[PDB]
Amino acid sequence: SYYRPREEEAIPHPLALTHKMGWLQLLGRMF
């Protein structure tokens, strides 16, 4: 695991997915 402050889990949420999706692509575990 790693420190990432933005690291929320909510699939419906615009947490990063809509703006640029910078870290979901390397994370993959929650979505």
Curated annotation (Swiss-Prot):
Disulfide bonds: none
N-terminal signal peptide: none
Extracellular side: 3-21
Expression by tissue: Abundantly expressed in CNS. Widely expressed at low levels. Detected in dorsal root ganglion (at protein level). Expressed in the keratinocyte layers of the outer root sheath and, to lesser extent, to the matrix of the hair follicles (at protein level).
Function as written in the Swiss-Prot or TrEMBL entry: Non-selective calcium permeant cation channel. It is activated by innocuous (warm) temperatures and shows an increased response at noxious temperatures greater than 39 degrees Celsius. Activation exhibits an outward rectification. The channel pore can dilate to provide permeability to larger cations. May associate with TRPV1 and may modulate its activity. Is a negative regulator of hair growth and cycling: TRPV3-coupled signaling suppresses keratinocyte proliferation in hair follicles and induces apoptosis and premature hair follicle regression (catagen).
Disease: Olmsted syndrome 1: An autosomal dominant, rare congenital disorder characterized by bilateral mutilating palmoplantar keratoderma and periorificial keratotic plaques with severe itching at all lesions. Diffuse alopecia, constriction of digits, and onychodystrophy have also been reported. Infections and squamous cell carcinomas can arise on the keratotic areas. The digital constriction may progress to autoamputation of fingers and toes. Palmoplantar keratoderma, non-epidermolytic, focal 2: A dermatological disorder characterized by non-epidermolytic, abnormal thickening of the skin on the palms and soles. Focal palmoplantar keratoderma consists of localized areas of hyperkeratosis located mainly on pressure points and sites of recurrent friction.
Record protein name field: Transient receptor potential cation channel subfamily V member 3
Range covered out of full length: 459 to 489 of 790
